[PDB]
Write a protein that binds this ligand. Structure first.
Ligand SMILES: O=C(CCC(=O)NCCc1ccc(Cl)c(Cl)c1)NCCCCn1cnc2c(Br)c(Br)c(Br)c(Br)c21
Ligand SMILES: [Cl-]
Length: 328
């Protein structure tokens, strides 16, 4: 069976308490120290507000959780605690409850979420390299901590383009990696789902996040956002196969003994693998380089186990200008 190439044993080498989130007992502080100022977003299991800590005037973000998901709350809390101090991971300041209702909430550091008003037109080639490198630091960190994010997408990446700060948010779908464990494929968001999810392959790993990363890189350098625009989960795989090829998909399935839902036979068609240069034109040529294409080609691979790790991606020549500026 399939196994991560990196970080495969790291949870088993740690104390059980590190990964046994069901046994975790958070310490719940007092939400009454926080004044909600403005709604920032809302999801199936939470709602997010900008807030002030009235005791010290600190601006923060409060994610109020639907309380019935007790196991899922412990999971997210323990993951965030394990990731404390990780580079470019959103900082969990505290875990609090309304002291009367006991509804739990998470308090995060505030970030300026730049409102990109022109579909990222303002970001240069160097900016894309710089922020991709920052995002990869977060993914290498969490993977090294035995955790898969499982919902990497633009919505979950805060960038303060004033201060050049990046944070990976929303750890509510994240999960500990244990070799040979079969995971639920109902994770990630449609456009960022790896082929393994779309073909119902449960034995996936950190490399799922690297597919999502690759989708983001393709959309940044080519300016087609999202890059793979499925109308539903079936069509999502078709959109991928139109680029990566159908014979190539079947070789992946064969390698891992993956059964394909037969509804796909009526919609996949026959598609030759496309050269990445096909996506270049006058509107994106300034963001595309041989290095970018080589990196992308090594991320957007069917075979999860052969995709670059976050560290291998960071070590690619595409990021040499960032590293050199980071030291010069
Ligand atoms: O608008 C966004 C981000 C959109 C966006 O384009 N990104 C940048 C993506 C990007 C772009 C270029 C590159 Cl090259 C790279 Cl790598 C990545 N997402 C919706 C916000 C939801 C509100 N929301 C929820 N939870 C929050 C938390 Br927690 C905090 Br803290 C804060 Br602040 C906010 Br706001 C929170
Ligand atoms: Cl799962």
């Amino acid at each position: 069976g399939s196994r991560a190439r990196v970080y495969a044993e790291v949870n088993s080498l740690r104390s059980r308490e590190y990964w046994d989130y069901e046994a975790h007992v958070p310490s719940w502080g007092n939400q009454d120290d926080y004044q909600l100022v403005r709604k920032l977003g809302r999801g199936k299991y939470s709602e997010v507000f900008e807030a002030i800590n009235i005791t010290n005037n600190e601006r923060v973000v409060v994610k109020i959780l639907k309380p019935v998901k007790k196991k899922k709350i412990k999971r997210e809390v323990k993951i965030l605690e394990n990731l404390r101090g990780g580079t470019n991971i959103i900082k969990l300041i505290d875990t609090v409850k309304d002291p009367v209702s006991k509804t739990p909430a998470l308090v995060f550091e505030y970030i300026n979420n730049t409102d990109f008003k022109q579909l990222y037109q303002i970001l240069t080639d160097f900016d894309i390299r710089f922020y991709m490198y920052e995002l990869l630091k977060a993914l290498d960190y969490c993977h090294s901590k035995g955790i898969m994010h499982r919902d990497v997408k633009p919505h979950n990446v805060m960038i303060d383009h004033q201060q050049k700060k990046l944070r990976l948010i929303d750890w509510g779908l994240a999960e500990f990696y244990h070799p040979a464990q079969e995971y639920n494929v109902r994770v990630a968001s449609r456009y960022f789902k790896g082929p393994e999810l779309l073909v119902d392959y449960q034995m996936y790993d950190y490399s799922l996040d690297m597919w999502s990363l690759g989708c983001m890189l393709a959309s940044m350098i080519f300016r087609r956002e999202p890059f793979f625009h499925g109308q539903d989960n079936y069509d999502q795989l078709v959109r991928i196969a139109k680029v990566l090829g159908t014979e190539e998909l079947y070789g992946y399935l064969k390698k891992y003994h993956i059964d394909l839902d037969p509804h796909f036979n009526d919609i996949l068609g026959q598609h030759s693998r496309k050269r990445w240069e096909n996506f270049i034109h006058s509107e994106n040529r300034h963001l595309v380089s041989p290095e970018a294409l080589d990196l992308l080609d090594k991320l957007l691979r069917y075979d999860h186990q052969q995709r670059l790790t976050a560290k291998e991606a960071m070590e690619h020549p595409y990021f040499y200008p960032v590293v050199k500026e980071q030291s010069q």
